[PDB]
């Protein structure tokens, strides 16, 4: 029912520095029917500038919201997305809801953007009630501590390493693996 979307910026939000706020990102990406969402711009920065202190604030914030929302999405620059997702997995041992990092290789303001798919993927999983920290990218949902950025110029940028894909949005269905 209720999800929080937390912006940290990244290539999805640029017009890598987050020009666009997270709420605006959702709009331009094309997810219109979401008012049973809320939005919080925590960062608005190029992810290659991510530092361990940034992790602390995000987790602090995440802790403020796990008992308040049904699911949580964090939008992120891709370059260090998996460092954040891995670190949050340790800081938030055993989340009571899904917490799902995502972002995009192409900014959402472009018409070829992978942002629509990645955002719809994160949404569908955050409403799934399957708890934990995850990464949503290119139709697939991967465990946050098992995700690595594997390609630098492809839509299929992320992979589950030594672990099986968690779920996959096929059409409008969430197929758990």
């Amino acid at each position: 029912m209720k999800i929080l979307l937390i912006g940290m910026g990244g290539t999805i939000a640029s017009v890598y520095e987050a020009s666009l706020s997270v709420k605006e990102v959702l709009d331009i990406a094309g997810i219109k029917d979401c008012e049973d969402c809320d939005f919080l711009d925590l960062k608005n920065v190029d992810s290659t500038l991510i530092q361990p202190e940034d992790w602390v604030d995000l987790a602090e914030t995440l802790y403020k919201n796990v008992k308040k929302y049904d699911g949580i999405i964090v939008t992120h620059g891709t370059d260090t997305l998996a460092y954040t997702s891995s670190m949050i997995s340790f800081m938030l041992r055993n989340p009571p809801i899904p917490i799902v990092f995502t972002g995009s290789m192409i900014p959402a303001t472009e018409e070829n953007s992978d942002a629509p798919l990645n955002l719809q993927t994160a949404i569908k999983f955050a409403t799934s009630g399957i708890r934990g920290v995850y990464v949503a990218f290119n139709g697939k949902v991967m465990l946050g501590v098992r995700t690595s950025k594997v390609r630098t110029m492809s839509r299929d940028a992320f992979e589950s390493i030594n672990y099986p894909i968690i779920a996959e949005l096929r059409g409008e269905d969430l197929v758990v693996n």
């Binding site: 460092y83 891995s86 340790f90 934990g132 501590v145 030594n162």
Partner: protein, 125 residues
Amino acid sequence: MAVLVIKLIPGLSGDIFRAAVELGYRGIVIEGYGAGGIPYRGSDLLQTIEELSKEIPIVMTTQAMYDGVDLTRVGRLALRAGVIPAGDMTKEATVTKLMWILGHTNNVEEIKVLMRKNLVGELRD
């Protein structure tokens, strides 16, 4: 809190490791060869590591993408030197796990236990 990540290549000595400890780095991750290579001839690496291992944690992962590390079967060697294996952890999970542990503890014997335990599914133990 700070951590150094070095990829093992041929013609690489302990000297740079000594300098990281000497710069206040708190942990080192090494991308070993294959399932956990550690050069033990024509190289001070095995010596140098065997020294620094009992000061800071020295973590061994792989420079490959898939399949963790198995020092049990070069590996046994490194394990007996003080090297902490990353098993099948991703590079990202390995770095962030270590850092998370650091800010909690400084004791290499404890870190070795935590680094070996599966906390959130990062690791097959």
